[PDB]
């Protein structure tokens, strides 16, 4: 029930459309402190247009769902990309802020980031068969060109489930952690479904104060948010992180098909760092793609 | 000088950022009508502040498009798509409609996310069979565009073209396997399809609209690049015999050594527009699929 506080969570029922759970951050954010709590209909915070879209959804099941939908509150001027998705009778919208110069450029940054995941995946097929090495080599580097994080790190689960960093690229200076093998439990069960869940997933800032959900207390069990983008981290993960001075992370998943996660792409920076929606979609795209190829070379 | 109705066009001075030619319905389109548009106009007067600094900033481009904009008073949203000649920078305009600018983004990651679907299931094809490779083209475009009609052309030595690959909606004479002549398709046209990239028809009975510039211009302003721009008034007519009312051609071009290898085509039998994050998306569908028709020579 904690959240990371660069964005914010609301829950909404299908039925009625309208708030059964929100983030603490929420009202500070979206509205002018009309307010916001349990019970409020989404008409009264956004303009038309994006309160009008925002319905739309709940008819579209979760084979045409189409993330993001850029809105804009009512009375602020205020846009963020609105992040969907749905767990039985219930909608949940992340919201991500955007800064007011990039409204009119949100179609053709999408593009572009669709682009170069796209061409990057041109590169992946043209490789000739055969090396493990020279894929993943290809893999972190095409990863670091586009995400421009400090570092990019692939791994591998062998069978004992442990993990082994089998590929590497750096910022020049830094420490190298190629060839390295640490214990399975560095990652714990929990931990690896989730990564399966939400195929990309992103840490701004492992020093973050975190802030927390609340849910209407009429409802007699909890609700299920582990799936939203803005999932925050264990504390426990957060300290290793700034231990090790990485900040920030984007994490891929490397499922393969006998499904199984074979490893993780991973990009950790050495400062805070947050990379939008079109993005973390398209690595969803190249993700999927390096599973293929993995598995063929397994053949 | 003619554009097709669909948009609307304006030039911009290179240096001065003002108005130096403009189409004729433009002042119809952006400012529900000195008169609020003309030779002179600064865009500052037209658009919303965001939306006229989203276009300034484009002045110093590297370019991305299509760039979401606003008009003053109405707020009535386009895509503005932007190009570059010598003296100045052309704009086509757009509609969109007001309730889906909420749902820009969404298709437009949905459209480049079919088309690369399409470019993995075209690259895993055996190699060994241009036949294989051309069906499965046209029937990855006859999903993506849905289209009445997907063809492909091939362009042989004495430049004749022959419809090497189709498929259909059921009912339609299908045109697989036909020659035709190379003066049906006249040099210049073949040229401005390698120069476009990916070019649309929308309604080939539309009327027309004239660009006007100001004469004492220095220099002739040039729509070849520009995505209205009208057919011949002598294709608009062929295509009614034929039933066909709107296209979508691809340009096939290898070793981009440059030649024209020949066309992905799609024909609709009724008024069919298709906006711009899509066609952007096709316009790397198809440099793909000429990187293995290269490869299969
Ligand atoms: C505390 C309860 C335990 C814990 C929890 C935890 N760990 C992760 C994720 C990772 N932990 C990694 C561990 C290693 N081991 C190494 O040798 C190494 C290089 C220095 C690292 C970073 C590891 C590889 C990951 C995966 C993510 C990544 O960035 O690579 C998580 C999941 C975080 C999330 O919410 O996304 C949790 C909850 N880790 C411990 O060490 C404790 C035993
Ligand atoms: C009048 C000046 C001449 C003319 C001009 C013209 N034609 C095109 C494009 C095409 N013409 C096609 C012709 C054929 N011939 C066939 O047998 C056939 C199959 C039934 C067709 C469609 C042809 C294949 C094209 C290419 C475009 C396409 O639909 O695939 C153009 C370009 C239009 C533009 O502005 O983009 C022009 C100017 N065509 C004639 O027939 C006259 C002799």
Redesign the interface.
């Given at each position: 029930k904690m959240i990371q506080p660069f964005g914010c969570l609301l829950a909404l029922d299908e039925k009625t459309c309208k708030v059964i759970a929100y983030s603490e951050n929420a009202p500070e954010m979206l509205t002018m402190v009309p307010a916001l709590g349990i019970g409020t209909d989404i008409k009264t915070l956004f303009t038309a247009?994006?309160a009008?879209?925002l319905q739309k959804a709940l008819g579209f099941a979760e084979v045409l769902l189409?993330?993001?939908?850029?809105?804009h509150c009512k009375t602020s001027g205020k846009p963020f990309?609105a992040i969907i998705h749905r767990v039985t009778g219930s909608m949940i919208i992340d919201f991500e802020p955007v800064k007011?110069?990039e409204?009119?450029?949100?179609?053709?940054?999408?593009?572009?980031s669709?682009?170069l995941?796209?061409k990057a995946?041109?590169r992946l097929?043209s490789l000739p068969s055969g090396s493990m090495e020279r894929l993943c080599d290809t893999m972190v580097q095409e990863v670091f060109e586009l995400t421009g994080y400090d570092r990019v790190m692939a791994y591998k689960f062998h069978e004992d489930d442990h993990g082994e960093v089998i590929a590497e690229i750096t910022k020049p200076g830094l420490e190298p952690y190629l060839g390295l093998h640490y214990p399975a439990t560095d990652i714990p069960q929990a931990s690896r479904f989730l990564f399966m869940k939400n195929k990309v997933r992103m840490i701004v800032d492992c020093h973050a104060k975190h802030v927390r959900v609340l849910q209407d207390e009429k409802l007699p069990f909890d609700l299920t948010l582990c799936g939203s983008t803005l999932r925050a981290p264990h504390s426990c993960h957060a300290q290793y992180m700034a231990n090790m001075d990485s900040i920030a992370s984007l994490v891929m998943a490397v499922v393969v098909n006998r499904k199984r996660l074979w490893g993780l792409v991973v990009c950790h920076n050495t400062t805070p760092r947050f990379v939008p929606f079109?993005l973390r979609?398209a690595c969803e795209?190249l993700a999927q793609?390096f599973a293929?190829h993995v598995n063929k070379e397994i053949e």
């Open positions: 247009p994006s009008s879209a189409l993330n993001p939908v850029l809105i990309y007011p110069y409204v009119p450029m949100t179609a053709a940054g999408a593009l572009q669709y682009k995941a796209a995946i041109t097929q079109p979609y795209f793609v293929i």
